[PDB]
Amino acid sequence: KKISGGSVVEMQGDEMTRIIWELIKEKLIFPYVELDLHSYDLGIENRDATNDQVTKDAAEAIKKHNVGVKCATITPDEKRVEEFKLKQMWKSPNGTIRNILGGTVFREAIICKNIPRLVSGWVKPIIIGHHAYGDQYRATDFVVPGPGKVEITYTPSDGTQKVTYLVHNFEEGGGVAMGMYNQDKSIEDFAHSSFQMALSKGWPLYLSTKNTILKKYDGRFKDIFQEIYDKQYKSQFEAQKIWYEHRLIDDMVAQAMKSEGGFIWACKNYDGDVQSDSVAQGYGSLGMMTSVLVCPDGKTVEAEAAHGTVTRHYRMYQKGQETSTNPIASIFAWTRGLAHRAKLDNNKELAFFANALEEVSIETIEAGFMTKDLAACIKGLPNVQRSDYLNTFEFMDKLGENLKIKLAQAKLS
């Protein structure tokens, strides 16, 4: 009857994405696929009840079963503490999971040909791999109050000679200073994840640094990537007629705007983070941005939407006002997780299903059925009328009918 899906780790989420997540399971997944589902409720309340232990348990389950699909979750702040009366201000579950798995998140826009892009020549997506460790995000910065000397020092653990460098001698007034770092193993894992992602997609890979300026700091990224490429991955790239190349960051961003798309882009922490919103708006909507965490083994993945829980739409839903929330990124978390599960298990039936759900979602939007965010990209939000879009539940119903028709004609060979 149903396709045997295998073991999948499922992580339930919050707010509007929580509603869509159950609609996806009930209307798109469960009628056709039978899964060994290991479910973890990462809803903000269950996280509070378990003192965030449910988040660590889910990450360990992903490590054992190799495939996880996650719904967007609330990252607590001070207002969230008051809203839910949380015991503590729990940290981001995405950060906790990524730190336990040790992978790199790759974000990819889902492209439908009728949705215009802000950059004219983009025909294929640009997949950015984000090294989410170190650099500015673990740095120590401080105000320099007046004249004085700032130095950075290194004291070896083996008791050998301590090294000291002059950062700056403030002579006239004050200013600011900061120290930051990165780690060899994290960079090596970042490289492995990047090479594995490029090989799975069959696309070339680019790493961006500023090693001409940061000769030691950024040069280490360039050296680690090149040595791992030359020793472990180059023949696989050549056999697929792809390649790896290092580029300076300023040249790289311009090359990305000029390109047609269709490459993997390994980004340092800052470079990947600061442009994520622009890539989403550049291709259309945040609702079309999916993501996958790829571990250096190439075997363990965790897929999820690259956007949040869409709190503003959830507030409208709570007051009975019509919402039109895009489910594509959430749906593609399931198809990408299920497609990886099928690749691990040599499951042709599941691989066919995952691709069929992708085609169904793209064909539906390209046929003119879309949510308000996509209609606004075509027409401009001030010009969007009610007849231009389907609400959140109508669009899920339309996807469910098209998927049923697609699989029914696929069963007729």
Ligand X SMILES: NC(=O)C1=CN([C@@H]2O[C@H](COP(=O)(O)OP(=O)(O)OC[C@H]3O[C@@H](n4cnc5c(N)ncnc54)[C@H](OP(=O)(O)O)[C@@H]3O)[C@@H](O)[C@H]2O)C=CC1
**In the complex, which residues of this chain contact ligand X (CB under 6 A)?**
72-75, 94, 212, 248, 251, 285-287, 304, 307-312, 325-326, 329, 373
Report the nearest approach of ligand 33O to the CB of residue 41 (Å).
Answer: 7
Closest by CA to 136, choosing from 306, 250, 274, 256, is: 274
31 binds, among ligand 9UO, ligand X, a second copy, none (CB under 5 to 8 A by kind): none
Backbone angles phi, psi at 14, to 5 degrees: -135, 155
Q: Is 137 among the residues that bind a second copy (CB under 8 A)?
A: yes
Tell me whether residue 117 is exposed, middle or buried, using C-beta atoms within 10 angstroms of its C-beta: 0 to 12, 13 to 18, 19 or more.
Answer: middle
Binds a second copy (CB under 8 A): choice among 211, 326, 335, 392: 211
Q: Which stretch binds a second copy (CB under 8 A): 32-40, 174-182, 342-350, 357-365?
A: 174-182
364 contacts 349 by C-beta, under 8 angstroms:
no
* Contacts of ligand 33O in 308-327 (CB under 6 A): 318-319
Cβ neighbours of 30 (radius 10 Å): 14
Which window, 156-164, 175-183, 278-286, 314-322, contacts ligand 9UO (CB under 6 A)? 278-286
Question: By CB under 6 A, what part of segment 24-43 binds ligand 33O?
Answer: 26, 43
Least distance (Å) from ligand X to the CB of residue 251? 4
304 contacts: CB under 8 Å, gap ≥ 6: 11, 69, 70, 71, 72, 94, 290, 291, 292, 293, 333
- Give yes or no for a contact between 313 and 108, defined as CB atoms under 8 angstroms apart: no
Stretch that binds ligand 9UO, among 5-13, 31-39, 46-54, 249-257 (CB under 6 A): 249-257
The piece of 17-25, 149-157, 167-175, 180-188 that touches ligand 33O (CB under 6 A) is 17-25
Q: Give the nearer residue to a second copy in terms of CB position, either 108 or 358.
A: 108
| Identity of the residue, 15 or 189, whose beta carbon is nearer to ligand 33O in the bound complex | 15
Q: How far is the CB of 8 from a second copy (least distance, A)?
A: 27
Non-local CB neighbours of 184 within 8 Å, separated by 6+ positions: 220, 224
Residues 131 and 122: beta-carbon distance below 8 Å? no
Q: What part of residues 291-310 is at the interface with ligand 33O (CB under 6 A)? A: none
Q: Encoding tokens for residue 10?
A: 């499922």
104-109 and 126-130 as β-strands: parallel, antiparallel, unpaired?
antiparallel
Q: 120: part of which helix (H) or strand (E)?
A: none
Four-CA torsion 9, 88, 20, 303, nearest 10 degrees: -40
Binding mask 101-140 for ligand 9UO (x = CB under 6 A): ------------------x---------------------
**Phi, psi (degrees; rounded to nearest 5) at 21:** -60, -45
- The residue from 85, 158, 320, 387 that contacts a second copy (CB under 8 A) is 158
Window contacting ligand 9UO (CB under 6 A); options: 9-17, 77-85, 267-275, 348-356: 267-275
- Least Cα distance to 96 among 44, 39, 55 occurs for 55
The footprint of ligand 9UO (CB under 6 A) covers: 119, 249, 253, 256-257, 271, 274-275, 278-279, 282
